[PDB]
Write a protein that binds this ligand. Sequence first.
Ligand SMILES: CCN1/C(=C/C(C)=O)Sc2ccc(O)cc21
Length: 343
Amino acid sequence: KVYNDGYDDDNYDYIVKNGEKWMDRYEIDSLIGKGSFGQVVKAYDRVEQEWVAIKIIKNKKAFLNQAQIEVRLLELMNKHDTEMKYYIVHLKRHFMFRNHLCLVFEMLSYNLYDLLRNTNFRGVSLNLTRKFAQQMCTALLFLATPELSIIHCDLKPENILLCNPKRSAIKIVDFGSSCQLGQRIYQYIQSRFYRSPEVLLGMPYDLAIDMWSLGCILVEMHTGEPLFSGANEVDQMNKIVEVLGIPPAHILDQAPKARKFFEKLPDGTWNLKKREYKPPGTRKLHNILGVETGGPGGRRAGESGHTVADYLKFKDLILRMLDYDPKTRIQPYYALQHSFFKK
Ligand SMILES: CCN1/C(=C/C(C)=O)Sc2ccc(O)cc21
């Protein structure tokens, strides 16, 4: 047996061959991304004389349809005048090639997870974390513009890439798992480590879940490690609880999956259901960040911009993003006005 006249493997993926040239225009260099959607290759565009990243979607309706949605969102975004739009990876064009939908993007650099790996998971300085945070908030502010109302829904280190390995500018990629505010067609969403409490609880979600993800991400960028690394959903909620405490009863009283993690005592209050975890709220963010001890592992003692004052501004902003209540979790516009960003 052979697939798609020999162009595809048995998993609907296009068999990538280095040096092959398509439509007398693109010269495929190499594979730079794999996914359930298909692949992402680096390629040289002979016509525009530039490197581009091409996302080759699997030759399968399920995937083709999911990608057409990403194309519409991207086209919808790029057609918006503001310069906040230069925080979203740019879709140059798309076309069908050998039965595969292809999205041509501008070529980017390393993703923030690779960045953390190049530090041996020790983290980057607070000053660079600040630059990333500022851009991320602007991007979220952008996605929040009414006509868009886009919920990225899968923010994580891997989906944030450096524009150039030298500069600190970033762009968010992968809008294949995205969606606009609406009905809840699906519930299991976001990468586990960055999954917001509302999602874990089975409650209605909106753009606020991206902000939760961002808060988890900023802490990871600076300490080098995932703030909440659950092996499964129960383990995940417990780790969130160690740091933030038991969620407010008003939220847990409406949480369809509340009893998956908590139990309501005869007096109406909620407790963890169950030395695996520190007591609720005892794993203080103040200490994870090392606010008064020279940062994570004290490896920042003495660095410019790593004063107790600087760290206090960073802790406050993170705590406003990790607000259990999505109604009062800080929004993009205000996060941007936070003193962590003031000069
Ligand atoms: C994995 C890398 N990656 C993308 C992944 C997805 C899922 O869309 S998209 C994209 C665009 C430019 C680039 O340089 C890398 C890149």
